[PDB]
Amino acid sequence: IENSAIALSGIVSVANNADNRLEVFGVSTDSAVWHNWQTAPLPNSSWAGWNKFNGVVTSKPAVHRNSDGRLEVFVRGTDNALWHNWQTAADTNTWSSWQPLYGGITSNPEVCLNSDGRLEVFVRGSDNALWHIWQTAAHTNSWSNWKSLGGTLTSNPAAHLNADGRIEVFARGADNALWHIWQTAAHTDQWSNWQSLKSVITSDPVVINNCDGRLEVFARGADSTLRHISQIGSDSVSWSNWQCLDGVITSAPAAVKNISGQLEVFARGADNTLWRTWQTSHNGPWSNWSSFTGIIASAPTVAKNSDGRIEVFVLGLDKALWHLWQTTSSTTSSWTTWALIGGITLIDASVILE
Amino acid sequence: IENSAIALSGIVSVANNADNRLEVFGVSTDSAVWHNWQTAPLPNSSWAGWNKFNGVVTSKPAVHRNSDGRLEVFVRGTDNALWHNWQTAADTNTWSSWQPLYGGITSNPEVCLNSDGRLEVFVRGSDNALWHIWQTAAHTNSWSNWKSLGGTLTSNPAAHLNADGRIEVFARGADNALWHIWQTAAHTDQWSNWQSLKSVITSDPVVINNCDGRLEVFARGADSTLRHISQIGSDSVSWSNWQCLDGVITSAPAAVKNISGQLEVFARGADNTLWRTWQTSHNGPWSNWSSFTGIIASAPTVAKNSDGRIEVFVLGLDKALWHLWQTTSSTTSSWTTWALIGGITLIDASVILE
Amino acid sequence: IENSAIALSGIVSVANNADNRLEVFGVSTDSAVWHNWQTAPLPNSSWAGWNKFNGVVTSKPAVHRNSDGRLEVFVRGTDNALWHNWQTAADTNTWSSWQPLYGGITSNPEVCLNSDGRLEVFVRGSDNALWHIWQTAAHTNSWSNWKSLGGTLTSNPAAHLNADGRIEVFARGADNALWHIWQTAAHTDQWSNWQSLKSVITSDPVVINNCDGRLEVFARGADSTLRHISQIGSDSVSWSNWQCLDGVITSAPAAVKNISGQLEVFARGADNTLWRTWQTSHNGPWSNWSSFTGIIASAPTVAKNSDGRIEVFVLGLDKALWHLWQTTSSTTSSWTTWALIGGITLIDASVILE
Amino acid sequence: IENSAIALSGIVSVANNADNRLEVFGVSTDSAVWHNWQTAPLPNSSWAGWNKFNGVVTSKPAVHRNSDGRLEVFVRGTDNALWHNWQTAADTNTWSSWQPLYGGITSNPEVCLNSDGRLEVFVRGSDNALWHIWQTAAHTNSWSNWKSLGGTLTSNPAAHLNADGRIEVFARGADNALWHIWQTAAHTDQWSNWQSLKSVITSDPVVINNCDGRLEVFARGADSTLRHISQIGSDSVSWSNWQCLDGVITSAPAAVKNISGQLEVFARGADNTLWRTWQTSHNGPWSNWSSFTGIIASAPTVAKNSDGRIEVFVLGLDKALWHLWQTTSSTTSSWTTWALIGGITLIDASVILE
């Protein structure tokens, strides 16, 4: 692989409803967003069926739950502007029409919830800088003007809260290295300068918090293996060295914290099957990759159910959505085999970044 | 102290709003519930002022946030029945009037949020058994009938979720020992039998989850010192031995997880000042108790702000509410001295259990 | 129990030879020291048979291996002075006669090996202060003059190295609290002042190092339960609060680090059987006490074999030595039942401290 | 670098005497072994001066302390056989002449001390298999016959004890991967079959035990970066995945456990200076590499002094031995700059393996 490659992404965005039912959002062959949801918050639940939002879109959709429990979806429109639509009440399948937020977008949108309950959206703009826009009041359809954070992005952005409420954003830069920028005070428009974490990456960055309140960033490296870096202090400036894990991966990774507090990472492996690795003890060593049967055609997207059970979504060779899950709420649980969530076929609507 | 003693409780109940502003609920000399809230989600914020709910009450109020962000308060009425009132919209200071849930209550109410978004209330009933009632749909004013879980309670109940979504309830029994009972499947009316954790306790139990996804229970013991016990497996049946910490405490304890994932416990000490102890490392040893200046007249009530800073509320000798907080989002931060949230005086409306 | 009580001690001292064979030393009804040893360094080995050292003694013997592999035993004589005898070559059953070190001794002797290979002996003297004497060259029969460290002792002393090579000594003081004193530079006659760790203790202190390079002290408390305290920094001045464990014990405790690095403690329990507790995770919570069948008449003495297996020695009701051990090198191993090391009967020759 | 490369080795072997004084062994321009020792067991001690053993040698010397405290050195002779010489008494500078152990050696010797006090030597033989020979009685000049363990070696062997006393040997195989073989019972001639840990390595393996009683193996990888793997269970068959650390290294690594139980690794870096990395927390993430001033011409050799302070030895550009050490017994201590141990110049006498 080349240093500027961006690994294959997940085919859907997932969120938990206010009642923790999972709901997935993807783009079909009509270039519209469709969604489907669990009827009860358990992995063996039946799903409602695929439902369409009217409107042609030109990016992968991003979804986040508002602080009042209402889901809200963000997408690029045919005008290269940002659009959004929302549930009109928590746990209800009544939505707004797409509504405009304007701007000029050249990446998939990334959405974060500040610790004061306000959504904030991060995107690459027309000038390749990082731009953002935010709710001016918690869970309200009142938004700021667009503002630039500068830089030069060559991946989609990934945002996460630090334990103290400061948003930190990660993105590949012009030199193909991972860069980051952060709020210097929680949920405030006061930001640091851009800083490099060095090392080339060949996927979007994936960010998760550990139990200790430290962030941990996962990405594919230049040799096509998983690499990871973590915060070692109580600020955004002190990081470990990078470490790689053996094993060639062929998609973005997806990371989740299991209910014992240990991290697990899922990725498409060198044989185009889903692979999984997990921390064997706290902060500990990583297990050898374990494979699941079945060829897959996207990165995994990973979620947790109301009872803690992990569930994984992928694109199958039939271009439909498949999923599997843990059979029990237990880190050493067995897994189901792939099951189909049928009714539509999906396309990868990710913005082509070069 | 005698084995059947119940240590002095906190004077207010606290909750975070959907936007993480703190809001406190207490009972004044008119035997009504009054509340007050931060105007912004930071500990140095100004407070709005004390506001009254009409109606005479006969217990400490319990408050929990619904899964749609709306706060909801539960109290015993003059008819010894359960009443509740709620915010009509998240982050809004418009409330229902008290509305009846009936029953017959002989303890303070305890409220838990199931992982499927449904509130559930636990109380000691007229026959001294544990009773409960639940929302039948997430964040909806539709409730079940009352149902008994049996047992014999001699403290208020304390409920917490396990990491897998099963509610577990703790309460002192007829033999003054700590007993517990648990859901055997997440957010389902399928419960275990009562089991004893032995050891006498002389306060209500206080329950918190650690990073590992294990519960940890704190209580005052028969010798008036803090003692604690924790889950050691992935179920509700495997527990450690009890351990005590030196130092006589004269109130219920209050426990919180700081933003490095370590536990801290606050209690009124033998000299009637606020004492604090913290875990020095993961699962680690406990620090010597540290004292804050100022005589206090209740147990502490402890909360966290949107930026992770801990804030503590107590009753002062002037029978008003005082608070202090951490100056920075840092485990070794200094603390402010007590500041007054003036405007009313408070009474301890806790149900007298004998 | 009274605050000045000293719990029942172990009936033998144990050491590993240079080749790791265990060898035990006790006092028989003739008031002489006898010893016995494994013929091979495994717990299921046969033992050689009880062999006598000529000479009447008036304390429990203390044994330590020299830095050249030779065992050396220290005891009080009929003249209340200190005597010692040694193997003349490692792993050889040829010994010196008792040789005099003089002084005036009113406790059992305690022996430590400095990290520069020199033995050092600690005792309570005729004036109840702590006295010591040391080899002036590693593993050589050349000793210093006696020197006082002051204080007032009401238990036997217990000495251990810190991770940086500084000896630290623990002993009960005149107020029945645990006190300690330490070298301020490794293997140097430069010592701190005495400092109290507060808390009353009713056994000799038992000291072990954890993996982290921190000392951890175990003792029986005033309520007859096990209590423990540990270093929390990198010096001898920073300690945790004391914690107690539920369960009444009726002997001194004995502590050992198993081969997974976790601590285990053994003690005679309230029903006069051997009890065991272990840390369930690193630094972690302690298990409930587990009992072994059989009434025992001393504290346990605990050792490890060349393959890591723990072995425990006690006095039986027949006044003979019994032992049991782990069946495999595994923290969850089963244990054998008590087996007799027959041939003599033993007496408790511990110096009566009041 | 090529896959069959073997990175530059350390220029001396080091051991602690019975009294913990460091003593170093190297080969000078006369192809004889010379040694030098601290006069006192502290890093700022003066050194005695370089002293020669008569006899021409053809490998790097290996040294280990016997279980009776006597050092013993192993080397290949001009006849390609194994020779050894020993201190005739602990802490004494009187040695035997070289004495023959015969055989036919094609690697540097590796020496391990069994947990029953018997030395055992591992070497590549004339047929490229692993051969070994052992003392038949602890710390005695009585040796077994030579015996083969088979395999095909393309590095020097590295041996370490497991926590349960089983020797495990690591060596690169014919496929340039790391292979290992182990005793199936402690200090017994009963061995497993050879098993591969996969991954190519380009240095000798370096093995250390962590606090948990698990082995951890460090080596340079095919991309010239440090990689490491560790045991995850209680046996020799369960290992983690391999992880790499960023940063090109140009020598074998050297690993040590500091006195807080954390691991540190030293290696010559890409700029030919000494680099260091350390675990920032238990099992934790690894720090960025830190450089010391000064160009160096060998791998580091690392030892610990009687007070826990780490000391590092290297070859300088002047072909003499230099060292530096920690200024205090503290993981965050500063370090001294390089100081010369002058008097001879050293050559790399490592056996050329192809």
Side-chain angles (χ1 to χ4, degrees):
Chain A
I1 60 171
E2 287 165 328
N3 282 5
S4 64
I6 291 290
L8 188 63
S9 196
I11 199 64
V12 290
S13 291
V14 57
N16 298 76
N17 276 278
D19 69 3
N20 269 325
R21 290 171 306 100
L22 296 182
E23 184 159 351
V24 301
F25 303 81
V27 182
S28 191
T29 51
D30 53 7
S31 296
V33 177
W34 293 68
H35 66 132
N36 201 339
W37 54 94
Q38 295 176 328
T39 64
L42 295 169
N44 61 325
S45 176
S46 61
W47 286 66
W50 289 101
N51 287 256
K52 177 186 185 163
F53 296 143
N54 290 325
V56 171
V57 307
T58 62
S59 73
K60 187 181 171 175
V63 57
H64 209 100
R65 193 173 62 203
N66 278 274
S67 53
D68 65 357
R70 296 177 304 101
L71 298 182
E72 183 159 350
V73 178
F74 298 83
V75 79
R76 191 177 67 173
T78 53
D79 56 4
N80 292 329
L82 187 68
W83 296 73
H84 64 143
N85 73 352
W86 54 89
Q87 288 172 331
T88 59
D91 291 315
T92 307
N93 309 304
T94 298
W95 291 69
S96 76
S97 54
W98 294 116
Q99 305 288 317
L101 285 169
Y102 301 98
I105 308 308
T106 62
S107 71
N108 295 330
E110 166 72 344
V111 55
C112 193
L113 180 62
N114 281 278
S115 59
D116 64 358
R118 296 179 304 100
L119 295 178
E120 187 156 351
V121 179
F122 298 91
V123 299
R124 191 178 70 172
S126 295
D127 60 358
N128 293 318
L130 180 64
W131 290 74
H132 63 145
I133 191 173
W134 53 91
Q135 288 174 334
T136 56
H139 52 77
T140 301
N141 184 25
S142 177
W143 292 72
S144 72
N145 290 331
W146 284 99
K147 194 156 172 199
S148 182
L149 286 166
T152 302
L153 275 56
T154 63
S155 74
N156 298 293
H160 208 274
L161 292 183
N162 283 270
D164 63 2
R166 296 175 306 102
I167 296 181
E168 185 159 351
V169 185
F170 300 84
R172 203 174 63 179
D175 57 0
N176 292 317
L178 175 66
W179 294 67
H180 69 135
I181 190 169
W182 54 95
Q183 289 176 336
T184 56
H187 55 72
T188 301
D189 187 28
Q190 285 187 287
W191 290 77
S192 75
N193 301 112
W194 285 97
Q195 294 195 12
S196 177
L197 290 174
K198 320 298 178 176
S199 177
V200 164
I201 63 171
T202 64
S203 68
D204 292 329
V206 176
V207 186
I208 194 167
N209 58 293
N210 68 36
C211 282
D212 300 335
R214 289 166 172 156
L215 299 185
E216 298 206 22
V217 178
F218 294 89
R220 196 178 61 177
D223 64 358
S224 206
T225 67
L226 181 69
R227 47 174 44 232
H228 64 114
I229 190 173
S230 65
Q231 290 174 341
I232 56 175
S234 41
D235 58 41
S236 296
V237 182
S238 319
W239 295 75
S240 69
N241 199 357
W242 286 91
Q243 283 195 96
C244 79
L245 276 161
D246 274 1
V248 170
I249 62 168
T250 59
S251 77
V256 69
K257 188 152 44 83
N258 68 27
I259 56 167
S260 309
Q262 255 55 262
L263 300 181
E264 310 194 14
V265 174
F266 295 79
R268 193 176 65 172
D271 65 358
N272 290 325
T273 68
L274 179 72
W275 290 7
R276 174 189 172 230
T277 183
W278 57 96
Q279 288 175 326
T280 55
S281 80
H282 189 215
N283 278 34
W286 289 87
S287 73
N288 278 308
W289 292 100
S290 179
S291 177
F292 299 80
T293 310
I295 302 287
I296 68 175
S298 67
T301 299
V302 185
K304 289 197 281 183
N305 284 268
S306 71
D307 63 2
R309 284 188 281 167
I310 297 164
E311 184 164 351
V312 183
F313 301 85
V314 298
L315 191 66
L317 287 170
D318 63 352
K319 304 170 196 279
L321 191 62
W322 297 71
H323 65 146
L324 58 71
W325 56 90
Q326 293 183 295
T327 53
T328 68
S329 305
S330 154
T331 56
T332 54
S333 174
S334 59
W335 298 78
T336 69
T337 58
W338 295 112
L340 175 68
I341 304 178
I344 62 170
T345 69
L346 300 169
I347 66 166
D348 182 3
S350 287
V351 177
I352 298 166
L353 295 165
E354 61 271 286
Chain B
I1 60 171
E2 287 165 328
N3 282 5
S4 64
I6 291 290
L8 188 63
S9 196
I11 199 64
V12 290
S13 291
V14 57
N16 298 76
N17 276 278
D19 69 3
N20 269 325
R21 290 171 306 100
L22 296 182
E23 184 159 351
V24 301
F25 303 81
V27 182
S28 191
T29 51
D30 53 7
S31 296
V33 177
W34 293 68
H35 66 132
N36 201 339
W37 54 94
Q38 295 176 328
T39 64
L42 295 169
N44 61 325
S45 176
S46 61
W47 286 66
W50 289 101
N51 287 256
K52 177 186 185 163
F53 296 143
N54 290 325
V56 171
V57 307
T58 62
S59 73
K60 187 181 171 175
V63 57
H64 209 100
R65 193 173 62 203
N66 278 274
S67 53
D68 65 357
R70 296 177 304 101
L71 298 182
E72 183 159 350
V73 178
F74 298 83
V75 79
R76 191 177 67 173
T78 53
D79 56 4
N80 292 329
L82 187 68
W83 296 73
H84 64 143
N85 73 352
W86 54 89
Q87 288 172 331
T88 59
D91 291 315
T92 307
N93 309 304
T94 298
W95 291 69
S96 76
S97 54
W98 294 116
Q99 305 288 317
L101 285 169
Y102 301 98
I105 308 308
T106 62
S107 71
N108 295 330
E110 166 72 344
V111 55
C112 193
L113 180 62
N114 281 278
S115 59
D116 64 358
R118 296 179 304 100
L119 295 178
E120 187 156 351
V121 179
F122 298 91
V123 299
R124 191 178 70 172
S126 295
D127 60 358
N128 293 318
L130 180 64
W131 290 74
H132 63 145
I133 191 173
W134 53 91
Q135 288 174 334
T136 56
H139 52 77
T140 301
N141 184 25
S142 177
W143 292 72
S144 72
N145 290 331
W146 284 99
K147 194 156 172 199
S148 182
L149 286 166
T152 302
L153 275 56
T154 63
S155 74
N156 298 293
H160 208 274
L161 292 183
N162 283 270
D164 63 2
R166 296 175 306 102
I167 296 181
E168 185 159 351
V169 185
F170 300 84
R172 203 174 63 179
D175 57 0
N176 292 317
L178 175 66
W179 294 67
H180 69 135
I181 190 169
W182 54 95
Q183 289 176 336
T184 56
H187 55 72
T188 301
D189 187 28
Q190 285 187 287
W191 290 77
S192 75
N193 301 112
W194 285 97
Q195 294 195 12
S196 177
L197 290 174
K198 320 298 178 176
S199 177
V200 164
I201 63 171
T202 64
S203 68
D204 292 329
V206 176
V207 186
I208 194 167
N209 58 293
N210 68 36
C211 282
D212 300 335
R214 289 166 172 156
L215 299 185
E216 298 206 22
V217 178
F218 294 89
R220 196 178 61 177
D223 64 358
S224 206
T225 67
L226 181 69
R227 47 174 44 232
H228 64 114
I229 190 173
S230 65
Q231 290 174 341
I232 56 175
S234 41
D235 58 41
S236 296
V237 182
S238 319
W239 295 75
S240 69
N241 199 357
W242 286 91
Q243 283 195 96
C244 79
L245 276 161
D246 274 1
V248 170
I249 62 168
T250 59
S251 77
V256 69
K257 188 152 44 83
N258 68 27
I259 56 167
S260 309
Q262 255 55 262
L263 300 181
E264 310 194 14
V265 174
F266 295 79
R268 193 176 65 172
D271 65 358
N272 290 325
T273 68
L274 179 72
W275 290 7
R276 174 189 172 230
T277 183
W278 57 96
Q279 288 175 326
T280 55
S281 80
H282 189 215
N283 278 34
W286 289 87
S287 73
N288 278 308
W289 292 100
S290 179
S291 177
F292 299 80
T293 310
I295 302 287
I296 68 175
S298 67
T301 299
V302 185
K304 289 197 281 183
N305 284 268
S306 71
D307 63 2
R309 284 188 281 167
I310 297 164
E311 184 164 351
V312 183
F313 301 85
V314 298
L315 191 66
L317 287 170
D318 63 352
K319 304 170 196 279
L321 191 62
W322 297 71
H323 65 146
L324 58 71
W325 56 90
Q326 293 183 295
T327 53
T328 68
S329 305
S330 154
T331 56
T332 54
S333 174
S334 59
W335 298 78
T336 69
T337 58
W338 295 112
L340 175 68
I341 304 178
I344 62 170
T345 69
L346 300 169
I347 66 166
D348 182 3
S350 287
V351 177
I352 298 166
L353 295 165
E354 61 271 286
Chain C
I1 60 171
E2 287 165 328
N3 282 5
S4 64
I6 291 290
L8 188 63
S9 196
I11 199 64
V12 290
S13 291
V14 57
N16 298 76
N17 276 278
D19 69 3
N20 269 325
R21 290 171 306 100
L22 296 182
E23 184 159 351
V24 301
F25 303 81
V27 182
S28 191
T29 51
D30 53 7
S31 296
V33 177
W34 293 68
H35 66 132
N36 201 339
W37 54 94
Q38 295 176 328
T39 64
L42 295 169
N44 61 325
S45 176
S46 61
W47 286 66
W50 289 101
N51 287 256
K52 177 186 185 163
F53 296 143
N54 290 325
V56 171
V57 307
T58 62
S59 73
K60 187 181 171 175
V63 57
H64 209 100
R65 193 173 62 203
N66 278 274
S67 53
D68 65 357
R70 296 177 304 101
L71 298 182
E72 183 159 350
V73 178
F74 298 83
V75 79
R76 191 177 67 173
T78 53
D79 56 4
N80 292 329
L82 187 68
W83 296 73
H84 64 143
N85 73 352
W86 54 89
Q87 288 172 331
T88 59
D91 291 315
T92 307
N93 309 304
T94 298
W95 291 69
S96 76
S97 54
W98 294 116
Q99 305 288 317
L101 285 169
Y102 301 98
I105 308 308
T106 62
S107 71
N108 295 330
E110 166 72 344
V111 55
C112 193
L113 180 62
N114 281 278
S115 59
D116 64 358
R118 296 179 304 100
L119 295 178
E120 187 156 351
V121 179
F122 298 91
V123 299
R124 191 178 70 172
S126 295
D127 60 358
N128 293 318
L130 180 64
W131 290 74
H132 63 145
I133 191 173
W134 53 91
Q135 288 174 334
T136 56
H139 52 77
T140 301
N141 184 25
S142 177
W143 292 72
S144 72
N145 290 331
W146 284 99
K147 194 156 172 199
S148 182
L149 286 166
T152 302
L153 275 56
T154 63
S155 74
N156 298 293
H160 208 274
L161 292 183
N162 283 270
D164 63 2
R166 296 175 306 102
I167 296 181
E168 185 159 351
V169 185
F170 300 84
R172 203 174 63 179
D175 57 0
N176 292 317
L178 175 66
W179 294 67
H180 69 135
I181 190 169
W182 54 95
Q183 289 176 336
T184 56
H187 55 72
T188 301
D189 187 28
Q190 285 187 287
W191 290 77
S192 75
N193 301 112
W194 285 97
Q195 294 195 12
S196 177
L197 290 174
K198 320 298 178 176
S199 177
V200 164
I201 63 171
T202 64
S203 68
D204 292 329
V206 176
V207 186
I208 194 167
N209 58 293
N210 68 36
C211 282
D212 300 335
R214 289 166 172 156
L215 299 185
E216 298 206 22
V217 178
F218 294 89
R220 196 178 61 177
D223 64 358
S224 206
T225 67
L226 181 69
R227 47 174 44 232
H228 64 114
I229 190 173
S230 65
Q231 290 174 341
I232 56 175
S234 41
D235 58 41
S236 296
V237 182
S238 319
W239 295 75
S240 69
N241 199 357
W242 286 91
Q243 283 195 96
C244 79
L245 276 161
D246 274 1
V248 170
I249 62 168
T250 59
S251 77
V256 69
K257 188 152 44 83
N258 68 27
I259 56 167
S260 309
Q262 255 55 262
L263 300 181
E264 310 194 14
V265 174
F266 295 79
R268 193 176 65 172
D271 65 358
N272 290 325
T273 68
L274 179 72
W275 290 7
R276 174 189 172 230
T277 183
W278 57 96
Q279 288 175 326
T280 55
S281 80
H282 189 215
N283 278 34
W286 289 87
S287 73
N288 278 308
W289 292 100
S290 179
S291 177
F292 299 80
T293 310
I295 302 287
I296 68 175
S298 67
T301 299
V302 185
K304 289 197 281 183
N305 284 268
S306 71
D307 63 2
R309 284 188 281 167
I310 297 164
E311 184 164 351
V312 183
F313 301 85
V314 298
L315 191 66
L317 287 170
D318 63 352
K319 304 170 196 279
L321 191 62
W322 297 71
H323 65 146
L324 58 71
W325 56 90
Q326 293 183 295
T327 53
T328 68
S329 305
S330 154
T331 56
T332 54
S333 174
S334 59
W335 298 78
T336 69
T337 58
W338 295 112
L340 175 68
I341 304 178
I344 62 170
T345 69
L346 300 169
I347 66 166
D348 182 3
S350 287
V351 177
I352 298 166
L353 295 165
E354 61 271 286
Chain D
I1 60 171
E2 287 165 328
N3 282 5
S4 64
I6 291 290
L8 188 63
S9 196
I11 199 64
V12 290
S13 291
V14 57
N16 298 76
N17 276 278
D19 69 3
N20 269 325
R21 290 171 306 100
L22 296 182
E23 184 159 351
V24 301
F25 303 81
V27 182
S28 191
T29 51
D30 53 7
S31 296
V33 177
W34 293 68
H35 66 132
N36 201 339
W37 54 94
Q38 295 176 328
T39 64
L42 295 169
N44 61 325
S45 176
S46 61
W47 286 66
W50 289 101
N51 287 256
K52 177 186 185 163
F53 296 143
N54 290 325
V56 171
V57 307
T58 62
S59 73
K60 187 181 171 175
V63 57
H64 209 100
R65 193 173 62 203
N66 278 274
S67 53
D68 65 357
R70 296 177 304 101
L71 298 182
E72 183 159 350
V73 178
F74 298 83
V75 79
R76 191 177 67 173
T78 53
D79 56 4
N80 292 329
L82 187 68
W83 296 73
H84 64 143
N85 73 352
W86 54 89
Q87 288 172 331
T88 59
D91 291 315
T92 307
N93 309 304
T94 298
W95 291 69
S96 76
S97 54
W98 294 116
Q99 305 288 317
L101 285 169
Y102 301 98
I105 308 308
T106 62
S107 71
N108 295 330
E110 166 72 344
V111 55
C112 193
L113 180 62
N114 281 278
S115 59
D116 64 358
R118 296 179 304 100
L119 295 178
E120 187 156 351
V121 179
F122 298 91
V123 299
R124 191 178 70 172
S126 295
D127 60 358
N128 293 318
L130 180 64
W131 290 74
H132 63 145
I133 191 173
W134 53 91
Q135 288 174 334
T136 56
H139 52 77
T140 301
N141 184 25
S142 177
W143 292 72
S144 72
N145 290 331
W146 284 99
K147 194 156 172 199
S148 182
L149 286 166
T152 302
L153 275 56
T154 63
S155 74
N156 298 293
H160 208 274
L161 292 183
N162 283 270
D164 63 2
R166 296 175 306 102
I167 296 181
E168 185 159 351
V169 185
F170 300 84
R172 203 174 63 179
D175 57 0
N176 292 317
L178 175 66
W179 294 67
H180 69 135
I181 190 169
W182 54 95
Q183 289 176 336
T184 56
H187 55 72
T188 301
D189 187 28
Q190 285 187 287
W191 290 77
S192 75
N193 301 112
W194 285 97
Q195 294 195 12
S196 177
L197 290 174
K198 320 298 178 176
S199 177
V200 164
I201 63 171
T202 64
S203 68
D204 292 329
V206 176
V207 186
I208 194 167
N209 58 293
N210 68 36
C211 282
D212 300 335
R214 289 166 172 156
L215 299 185
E216 298 206 22
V217 178
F218 294 89
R220 196 178 61 177
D223 64 358
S224 206
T225 67
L226 181 69
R227 47 174 44 232
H228 64 114
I229 190 173
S230 65
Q231 290 174 341
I232 56 175
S234 41
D235 58 41
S236 296
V237 182
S238 319
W239 295 75
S240 69
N241 199 357
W242 286 91
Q243 283 195 96
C244 79
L245 276 161
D246 274 1
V248 170
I249 62 168
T250 59
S251 77
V256 69
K257 188 152 44 83
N258 68 27
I259 56 167
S260 309
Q262 255 55 262
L263 300 181
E264 310 194 14
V265 174
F266 295 79
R268 193 176 65 172
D271 65 358
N272 290 325
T273 68
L274 179 72
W275 290 7
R276 174 189 172 230
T277 183
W278 57 96
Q279 288 175 326
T280 55
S281 80
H282 189 215
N283 278 34
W286 289 87
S287 73
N288 278 308
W289 292 100
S290 179
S291 177
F292 299 80
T293 310
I295 302 287
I296 68 175
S298 67
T301 299
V302 185
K304 289 197 281 183
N305 284 268
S306 71
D307 63 2
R309 284 188 281 167
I310 297 164
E311 184 164 351
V312 183
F313 301 85
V314 298
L315 191 66
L317 287 170
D318 63 352
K319 304 170 196 279
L321 191 62
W322 297 71
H323 65 146
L324 58 71
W325 56 90
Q326 293 183 295
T327 53
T328 68
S329 305
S330 154
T331 56
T332 54
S333 174
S334 59
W335 298 78
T336 69
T337 58
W338 295 112
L340 175 68
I341 304 178
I344 62 170
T345 69
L346 300 169
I347 66 166
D348 182 3
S350 287
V351 177
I352 298 166
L353 295 165
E354 61 271 286

